[PDB]
Amino acid sequence: XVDINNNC
Amino acid sequence: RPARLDQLLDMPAAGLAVQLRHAWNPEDRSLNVFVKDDDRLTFHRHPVAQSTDGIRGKVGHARGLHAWQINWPARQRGTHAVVGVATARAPLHSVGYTALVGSDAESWGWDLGRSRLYHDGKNQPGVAYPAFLFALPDSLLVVLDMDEGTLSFIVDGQYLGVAFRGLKGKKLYPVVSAVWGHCEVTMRYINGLDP
């Protein structure tokens, strides 16, 4: 997970 | 600080029925959020990438002074955790991660992490808030004065001043916009005063 808004 | 603010706050807070009547609206939301089965005052945001999601309260305020508490765990805020008010026209969803509440003329919001106020945010720069400055705790109060046409906030018992002006004549609903996967935001209506 790359996503920084906990959307993975 | 208005005298009416303390009069509202120092009354015993509204009971469960009133809290429920003013809670998040399951009919007025981004499809990516849902009101929890075990707690009708809290929503849960599904973990959707590149999506900003909002929900309004059930009640649109036209007159009087109103306050509600937002409980938003600091670790569940992400890049844009915005708290405020909106007309019925404010979009409740955007693609990407944005300060959706406060993005156009239909909503006014305080972006919690940036400590910035947005209104017509697509065309207008954010405003530092509080004006005296600030790490935000999990809960805050939102004070909507539909008679003065103001939006204000109370953090840790401290009145932070007027955030927005020019709200009179509008029907304004509590609103938030969230970007964090699995975030849960609770809203509890405190009380209202007549004009």
Swiss-Prot record, chain B:
Any Gene Ontology CC annotation: SCF ubiquitin ligase complex
UniProt keyword Cytoplasm, yes or no: yes
Main location: cytoplasm
Gene Ontology BP, a term: protein ubiquitination
Cell compartment(s), UniProt: Cytoplasm; Cytoplasm, Cytosol
Record pathway: Protein modification; protein ubiquitination
Function according to Swiss-Prot or TrEMBL: Substrate recognition component of a SCF-like ECS (Elongin BC-CUL2/5-SOCS-box protein) E3 ubiquitin-protein ligase complex which mediates the ubiquitination and subsequent proteasomal degradation of target proteins. Negatively regulates nitric oxide (NO) production and limits cellular toxicity in activated macrophages by mediating the ubiquitination and proteasomal degradation of NOS2. Acts as a bridge which links NOS2 with the ECS E3 ubiquitin ligase complex components ELOC and CUL5.
UniProt similarity note: Belongs to the SPSB family.
UniProt note: domains: The SOCS box domain mediates the interaction with the Elongin BC complex, an adapter module in different E3 ubiquitin ligase complexes. Essential for its ability to link NOS2 and the ECS E3 ubiquitin ligase complex components ELOC and CUL5.
Name of the protein in question: SPRY domain-containing SOCS box protein 4
Gene name, Swiss-Prot/TrEMBL: SPSB4
Shown residues in whole-protein numbering: 33 to 232 of 273
